Ligand binder design. Structure first.
Ligand SMILES: COc1cc(Nc2ncc3c(n2)-c2ccc(Cl)cc2C(c2c(F)cccc2OC)=NC3)ccc1C(=O)O
Length: 263
């Protein structure tokens, strides 16, 4: 099932974006009132668009994890149709970190990566391949919890066997996670900067990998490199990534850089 919500229990308060299917709002939901994100289906939709739009909520409704965006419910009996999710105060991860450049501890950044990895582990253990994992598709709440969203072709986030041979697996999601680690540790820099998609694919085949971010711990960058192994069977699983990041968090000197020992 999917909880069906009566439109009188929703208040749209502010437009916060333009989605694939229509406008997206911040609002409130009566259940004590809770802040929500509200995706609407624009009037004048094709049957395919209506099916696609409501399919997102079908997938999302199958999952319940602290690092996966919560579906509160849908409005499908009234118009416009709406998908109601938990509101995430700090928005998209890549934009959040760019606005906060240099303002987090390395422990805090690794903790965000730990949450993302835990959400992805849950997805993989439910045999869900995401295929579109990127910092723009992760949301951050006011307590800095990061949650995967976007349940429904960007070359530089995709594993080469998925580009060349359309082999999308949890292992290719792991490649994407590596790129996400690099987005996080650079505070939202664009992967491969403005190299062309062709130059990106060419460099990866020749063995180029993204370079170490400034002040990135050695174990974190080497974990990225392991996620970017050309042969997908040599990549860590998400269960391994979660276990590795927990060890680093528990030995936090492993995360320190020079400024932690000087000005
Ligand atoms: C977009 O900007 C924000 C969104 C915020 N919150 C928020 N919370 C939930 C959602 C969204 N946005 C949002 C806003 C606009 C758009 Cl177009 C989409 C969404 C999404 C969303 C996403 F960010 C990525 C992928 C899929 C999404 O919907 C499923 N999911 C729901 C908060 C702050 C900001 C900000 O920049 O200050």
């Amino acid at each position: 099932f999917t909880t069906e919500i009566h439109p009188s229990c929703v208040t749209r308060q502010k437009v916060i974006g333009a989605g694939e299917f229509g406008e997206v709002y911040k609002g409130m939901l009566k259940t004590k009132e809770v802040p929500v994100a509200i995706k609407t289906l624009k009037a004048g939709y094709t049957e395919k668009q209506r099916v696609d739009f409501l399919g997102e909520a079908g997938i999302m409704g199958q999952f319940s994890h602290h690092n996966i965006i919560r579906l509160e419910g849908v409005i499908s009996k009234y118009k416009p149709m709406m998908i109601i999710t938990e509101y995430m105060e700090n928005g998209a991860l890549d934009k959040f970190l760019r606005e906060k450049d240099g303002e987090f501890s390395v422990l805090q950044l690794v903790g965000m990566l730990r949450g993302i990895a835990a959400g992805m582990k849950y997805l993989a253990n439910m045999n869900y391949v995401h295929r579109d994992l990127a910092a723009r598709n992760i949301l951050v709440n006011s307590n800095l919890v990061c949650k995967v969203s976007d349940f429904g072709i960007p070359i530089r986030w995709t594993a080469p066997e998925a580009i060349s041979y359309r082999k999308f697996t949890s292992a290719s999601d792991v490649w994407s996670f590596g790129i996400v680690m690099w987005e996080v540790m650079t505070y939202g820099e664009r992967p491969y900067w403005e190299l062309s998609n062709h130059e990106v694919m060419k460099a990866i085949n020749d063995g180029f990998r993204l370079p170490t971010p400034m002040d990135c711990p050695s174990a974190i960058y080497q974990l990225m490199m392991q996620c970017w192994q050309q042969e997908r069977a040599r990549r860590p699983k998400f269960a391994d990534i979660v276990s590795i990041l927990d060890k680093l968090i528990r030995a936090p000197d492993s995360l320190k850089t020079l400024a932690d020992f000087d000005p």
